[PDB]
Amino acid sequence: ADYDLKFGMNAGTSSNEYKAAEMFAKEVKEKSQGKIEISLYPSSQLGDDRAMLKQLKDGSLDFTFAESARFQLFYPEAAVFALPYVISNYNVAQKALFDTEFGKDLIKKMDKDLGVTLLSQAYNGTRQTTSNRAINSIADMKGLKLRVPNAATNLAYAKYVGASPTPMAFSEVYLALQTNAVDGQENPLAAVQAQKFYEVQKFLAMTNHILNDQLYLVSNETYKELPEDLQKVVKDAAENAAKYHTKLFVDGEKDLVTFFEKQGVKITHPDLVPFKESMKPYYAEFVKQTGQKGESALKQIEAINPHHH
Ligand SMILES: CC(=O)N[C@H]1[C@H]([C@H](O)[C@H](O)CO)O[C@](O)(C(=O)O)C[C@@H]1O
């Protein structure tokens, strides 16, 4: 094609992310009259999301996904998006990104500093905790070998609840669980399904601890080369795909505990009061480390009412 473009992702071929990216690719191909074709590179073929962001920056990858929280790698205050229990729901995550001074400035920096244009934002689920033994209360976390991604906020989740974290890439998790090299992991329900972690985890606990969004990102090196009518095709398709993406996650969060129970997983509902209590020292550390910019981002986000209006 005129524009042979590539979209990399950690998510696999059985995921909502992939299905939404397929929708995006199809609409772009159609509405561009075949000028643009977007090929997909799932399951961390191209590296992880840190690597794929670097490839968007240098122009060697055209599209990828990232959470708003992942920009904590560059702007420490952006960890606010994944401080456990801070962002209440997706309504808050949307307004945090688009309708705060903090979020608007973040978007501008992503463009200026990181070489990426934000096309759209979707919901990517609320993280829960699976394990090889029941989590009936916070006590059960103590010393649980809890896999986390290579992200400071998830490592802190594990530390502050009393678990023993083991960081590793998404691709490595299934084997780690299967072999009981670790005792558990944490991810939204849809990823537990997509990755078939339910095959290798007997328990799932509704810890509700981190709220993931998902940004459709394009390399500025690519976006600038598309004539404006094709930029519009891409942007509009990313917006349409993000709405679909969100819906996939919303619908699964109603349908998936019963799916897992039919697969033999035991579901628990530990009291979250002490989980939330355990994060208070972590918030204080975040404020100490990130200074006024972190205190301001918190304040801006804590001011957002979570009820749709
Ligand atoms: C956009 C993206 O790649 N998301 C991935 C996230 C983030 O890397 C992580 O939350 C840090 O931001 O990690 C996973 O949940 C994980 O490894 O368990 C896989 C998921 O596909």
Author numbering: 1 to 309
Direct quotes from the study:
We attempted to crystallize the wild-type protein with this non-cognate sialylamide ligand and were able to collect data to atomic resolution of 1.05 Å where ab initio phasing was applied to remove any model bias. Mass spectrometry data confirmed the presence of trace amounts of Neu5Ac in the sialylamide sample despite purification after synthesis using silica and ion-exchange chromatography and checked by one-dimensional 1H NMR. Crystallization of the wild-type SiaP with the same preparation of sialylamide revealed that the arginine is able to “fish out” even the minimal amounts of Neu5Ac present in this sialylamide preparation, analogous to conditions of limited environmental nutrients. These data also suggest that sialylamide probably is not a true ligand for wild-type SiaP, and binding detected in Muller et al. was likely due to this low level of contamination with Neu5Ac. Binding of N-acetylneuraminic acid (Neu5Ac) to C-terminally hexahistidine-tagged wild-type SiaP-His6 yielded a KD of 0.14 ± 0.04 μm, in close agreement with published data for native or N-terminally His-tagged versions.
Tripartite ATP-independent periplasmic (TRAP) transporters are secondary transporters that have evolved an obligate dependence on a substrate-binding protein (SBP) to confer unidirectional transport. We investigated the significance of this interaction using the sialic acid-specific SBP, SiaP, from the Haemophilus influenzae virulence-related SiaPQM TRAP transporter. The first structure of a TRAP SBP revealed that the charge of the carboxylate group of the ligand, sialic acid, was neutralized by an arginine residue, Arg-147, in SiaP, which sequence analysis had revealed to be the most highly conserved residue, being present in 98% of TRAP SBPs of the common DctP family.
